[PDB]
Paper text:
Sirtuin 6 (SIRT6) is an NAD-dependent protein deacylase that targets lysine residues in histones in the cell nucleus, where it helps maintain genome stability and links metabolism to epigenetic control. SIRT6 prefers acetylated histone H3 incorporated into nucleosomes, distinguishing it from other sirtuin family members that prefer free histone substrates. This specificity is attributed to recognition of the nucleosome acidic patch by its unique zinc-binding loop and interactions with nucleosomal DNA, which position it to selectively deacylate histone H3 (21, 22). While SIRT6 erases H3K9ac fastest among the N-terminal H3 acetylations, it exhibits robust activity against multiple acetylation sites, such as H3K27ac, and longer linear acylations in vitro.
To understand the mechanisms of plasticity in substrate recognition by SIRT6, we employed cryo-EM to visualize a complex of SIRT6 bound to a H3K27MTU containing nucleosomal substrate. We reconstituted nucleosomes with H3K27MTU and 185 base pairs of DNA. In the presence of NAD, SIRT6 forms a covalent intermediate analog with the MTU group allowing us to capture this normally transient interaction. Using single-particle cryo-EM, we determined the structure of the SIRT6–H3K27MTU–nucleosome complex at an overall resolution of 3.2 Å (Fourier shell correlation: 0.143) from 124,724 particles with good density for SIRT6 on one side of the nucleosomal disc. Core residues of SIRT6 from 2 to 290 were visible. The SIRT6 zinc-binding loop is bound to the acidic patch, whereas the Rossman fold containing the H3K27MTU analog reaches across the nucleosome surface and engages DNA at SHL 6.5. One constant feature across both structures is SIRT6's interaction with the nucleosome acidic patch, where residues K170, R172, and R175 engage with acidic residues on H2A (residues E56, E61, E64, D90, and E92). First, the catalytic region of SIRT6, comprised of the two Rossmann folds (residues 25–133 and 195–268), underwent a ∼25 Å movement compared with the H3K9MTU-bound structure. While these same residues maintain DNA backbone contacts in our H3K27-bound structure, their interaction point shifts toward SHL 6, indicating precise repositioning of the enzyme's DNA-binding interface in the presence of a substrate that is located closer to the H3 core. Although both H3K9MTU and H3K27MTU structures show DNA peeling from SHL 5.5 to 7, the H3K27MTU structure exhibits an additional rotation away from the histone core.
Numbering used by the authors:
A (entry chain B): 20 to 102
B (entry chain F): 25 to 102
C (entry chain H), D (entry chain D): 29 to 121
E (entry chain E): 40 to 134
F (entry chain A): 25 to 28, 39 to 134
G (entry chain G): 14 to 118
H (entry chain C): 11 to 122
I (entry chain K): 2 to 290
Amino acid sequence: KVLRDNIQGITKPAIRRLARRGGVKRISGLIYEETRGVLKVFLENVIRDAVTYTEHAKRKTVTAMDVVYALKRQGRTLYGFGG
Amino acid sequence: NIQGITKPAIRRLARRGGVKRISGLIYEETRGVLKVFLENVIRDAVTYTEHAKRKTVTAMDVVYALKRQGRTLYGFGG
Amino acid sequence: TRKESYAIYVYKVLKQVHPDTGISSKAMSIMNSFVNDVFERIAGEASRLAHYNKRSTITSREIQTAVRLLLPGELAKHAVSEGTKAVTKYTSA
Amino acid sequence: TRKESYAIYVYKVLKQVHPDTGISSKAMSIMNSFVNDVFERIAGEASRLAHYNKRSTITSREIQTAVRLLLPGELAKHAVSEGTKAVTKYTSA
Amino acid sequence: RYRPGTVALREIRRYQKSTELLIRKLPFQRLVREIAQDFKTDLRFQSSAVMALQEASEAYLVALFEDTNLAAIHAKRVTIMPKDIQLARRIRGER
Amino acid sequence: ARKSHRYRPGTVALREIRRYQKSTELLIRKLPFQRLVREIAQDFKTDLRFQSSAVMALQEASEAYLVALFEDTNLAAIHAKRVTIMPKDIQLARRIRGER
Amino acid sequence: AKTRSSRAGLQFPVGRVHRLLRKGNYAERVGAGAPVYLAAVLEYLTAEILELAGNAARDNKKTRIIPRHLQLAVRNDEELNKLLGRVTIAQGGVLPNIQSVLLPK
Amino acid sequence: RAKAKTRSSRAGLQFPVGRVHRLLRKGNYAERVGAGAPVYLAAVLEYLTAEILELAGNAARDNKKTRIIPRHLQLAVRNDEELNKLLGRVTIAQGGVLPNIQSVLLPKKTES
Amino acid sequence: SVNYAAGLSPYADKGKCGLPEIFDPPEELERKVWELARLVWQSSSVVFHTGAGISTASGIPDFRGPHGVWTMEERGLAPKFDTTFESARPTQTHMALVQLERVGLLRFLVSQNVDGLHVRSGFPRDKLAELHGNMFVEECAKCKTQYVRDTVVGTMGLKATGRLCTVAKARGLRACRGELRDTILDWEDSLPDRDLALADEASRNADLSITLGTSLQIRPSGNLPLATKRRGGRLVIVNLQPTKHDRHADLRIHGYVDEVMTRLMKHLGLEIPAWDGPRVLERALPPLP
DNA sequence: TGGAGAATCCCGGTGCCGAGGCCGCTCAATTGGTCGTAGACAGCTCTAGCACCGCTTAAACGCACGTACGCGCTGTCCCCCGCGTTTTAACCGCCAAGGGGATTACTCCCTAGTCTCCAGGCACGTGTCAGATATATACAT
DNA sequence: ATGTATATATCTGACACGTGCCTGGAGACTAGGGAGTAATCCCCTTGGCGGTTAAAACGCGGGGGACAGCGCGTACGTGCGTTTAAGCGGTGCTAGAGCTGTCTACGACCAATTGAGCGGCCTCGGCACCGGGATTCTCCA
Ligand SMILES: *C1O[C@@H]2[C@H](O)[C@@H](COP(=O)(O)OP(=O)(O)OC[C@H]3O[C@@H](n4cnc5c(N)ncnc54)[C@H](O)[C@@H]3O)O[C@@H]2S1
Ligand SMILES: [Zn+2]
């Protein structure tokens, strides 16, 4: 129930695919840990805002609209989930 | 009238920024960037002024223009 | 309870501009979100314009100034032209 | 003309925290603008929070949530602490 | 066999043409739940919520990698290193 | 008190950096900048009167913007194993910032 | 006709726009001409984005519109891109492009 | 009527509660405003002002002055990570910039 | 006993290594300390000035003398040391000055040494002015809060030590996180604000100030007793080497500071406490009869 | 220059879940009328933006010289990349439990709206205090 | 005897304090509706299991470029002397910013009416998927 070190779930081929989508032709070995850390920080910010929205609404589920509002607050408005 | 921003002025701005050496071709690019930034801010401020039916561009209009562009400026009221 | 969406009017506009083209549910939801966001932007800017000048009513002038402040050049000019056309055709009849 | 500002209250707070220290007029203007900006941000976030939950009122809960969303780090924690203490003292009276 | 570097461009073209979600869904959901465990305990994420989180994260990472590649090319290189990511995040006001 | 020819090219620049990062006065001549603001605003609405505080606010905003841009440009130039900021550094800094 | 949207040359709901303006906590009073203007602007912007998306779909040998077409339409037009710079379209992907030096020589 | 003791005095604050209540009501943020919202908002504003002013006074002490100027406010803000994050987009007028010189630009000693 | 010669900066324009250790005849020294005692016993505002000649008796070498660190670093290479700041045994003069403050005769003290032995001797910190600094004191960069440590911070040039400020404030204002920099002035560095201000005030108010164990060659620290005699007042310069203001000196000694201070106390009938560890005390102790 | 291939564009067949149309209707949009006031319009004034000039002089501009840096070429080596086999766990399909989101009554406490009373807050005046500059005196060379 | 440094005095500016004046805030009050609070329903999330199998992991070799070093040209830094227009302090003028006064066109609100957009209903097809045929840079030669 207490999930641990799931950041390793973001594997080397996944970050490589993301880089290739971003136009990268060659990727250093050290890039993967840095990308994992950046993704973790971004997720922590977005999830903190979403959980704040949820807890204010007296709910116990993180609705998609909570994530949409959290992204909108941080200037990363997302279209395709309502709002 | 753009040349009023002299090379020593841009050098002083760079020194404030932290720059140690400045290529000779920096100055034109800095002038262009300044012109674009001022164009945007002035356009917003003049639109605000025209809306309020004023012939004078009040300072608060510039403050609101900057706030709209995500560059809130303190010390001028508002 | 039933929810509100701009699906019907987006459909009508799509049929008017592309009479032989469809649209996916995901694309319709994206368009609904876009319409909501642009409406919120314009309305909030109009409210700020009214509040700045001590006005208490969001008239067509506030909306015009907001749409001129939000959209870039060509988009703002076309939007303001169409809004003026709509108001003229509305008040006239 | 009747102008409104937070100058007196800022000066009172300063003299409460720094018994022997002045403040320039320009610095006072910056502080007044800062108070206005933070007030606007917190109030707007509270309004959006009220609109999301289909509520038609703003309460200490909405302001607390807005403070949590806006202020980062220990700043938000201590701001919430001070607001809660103020509200409980006010209600106790 | 292919001389190194030629299939990197092929992967670039293939993964830029397509629009699916690059990261695997289940590990990302586990990561999101682990992250959320820190703030409040025993949440219940809607599937749409985790899909939104994944879309946002993938878009953010693709944009960050594009900026990082621009920084690397500016540095007279072809390979992106952590310093390029640091530069890209610093020039954008992040961190 | 404290505890107590030609300069090598590079030391006077450091002295200038130390001097200008410890002061607060605006680093652009007020009259030419005011003329520039009037010229830029000329293209939008003619016979437009500017408050003095408006010109001062514009100057402060532009000064802060250019100083921040030059800070990012210097960081980019250092990243490229260099000391002299070039136009490509400014272009990269703006492009990463999102303005370009 | 009877409906305000019909009297104006629009397809968007003027009544719904007016109700949202009144209930949205924007101002104490809402002018009778504001809903017409706001609906007109929304209709024009939807028309523009849908026209570009449909053009992309036609160029993509597709008879419908999918998020990818919307993303391509938004990113391939400078004015809309500046308008929608801080938005991400789910399932929209990224505009295809490669750097000028990574190409084979 | 009895003696008019202001809401701020009862709350214990220094910022005005009645004024912030009026700003909330006339600001068009909600159809109605709670009776505890002005108190909480005023307390938060007072705390933030007190933090900025305390750091500015420390800055002025370090700079050898007895009067706060915009430079002291800028130094107080940019030297605190939380305030810098909160005030990231602001440009405090006449505040200058922090004294930052990159290590690479510094000269190399151990001469002679 | 780490030397503040290379630690300060490579630039060192001392230009003083030939220092004849002139010693006074015992009878002339006795008469001079006698007249100094007669003057000081009646002078009200008395402020002292301790340099790096007092702690030479402790064991840490001086700077300018024949055994001075700078002297050895200039003439060849032979820096000799015996003790350490942690093990630094306070000199009898430190406790003598502590007693002088206790009885209230010592109005103020403006030292320029670095070991902080006066602070470790229990001298009220509100009465001292460590112009150059003190190793056992690290101050918070942010809020200028000063911490007395029992172990040397171990840094030079006003630099971060690695510990964050650990004091808190009222109203819920967040506890500070200052870098906790050190206190020792490198060449061409500013003095400590109101410590220097208090030293100037005390020396101006001092109608009789005696400067001990210092050559007075250094900035302000050697100039305070110049101002102690301007606008009135007498200056007594007790030092072996010829000081930079002997021409302006109203008195002079050639002998051990320990011996002359002991004779001064014996004439005054005053006794001396016998050192301690880091028994630091800040608030001014009440005057004694 | 030429020649074999992995991967890619494209033609033919086609069937399911999603796009598209039907329709009853029920709550929201529409028409007409009443009333208070927010703002349209006109006046007055006097604040401050604007225009111009003379004198000071701090800064801008042009040139000269040299060195510190940028830039390019060349040579490791080492660190990725591409490919092939193992294996590791995602993915999908289906099924169960039950928590928690969503809707519905009752109601009751809280806040909008009014009115009256009056001290807190602002505009102005002022004098006092602090800081900076200039002059005079004393000391040193 | 002259030059420089320090100290004291005077002048100017800015601001904290003091004062009267007024209007926006506090106390007391009532009415009604927003939202607590409890009950009920069932949608969707969690959880599990099992099979096929797509993608991750690991190893191995080679070859591409990262990086360091060295050498050459020249562009910028620094300095100096000549220019010039910014800065400051004057007056002198007037466009229009801000306030006030008056009145009416318009938005809020309400009653009564009806119609159109939504939930659930079914029908039909666009393209993902499959088979193979022809085509483009890679790599080698
Ligand atoms: C930065 O910090 C350093 C510190 O603050 C002082 C150290 O030098 P001073 O104290 O100014 O002078 P100093 O070199 O100590 O001159 C005193 C002279 O006295 C001689 N001496 C040794 N022991 C003595 C006793 N017991 N009595 C009298 N004189 C004595 C020394 O040999 C020395 O010549 O400034 C620096 S810079
Ligand atoms: Zn501290």
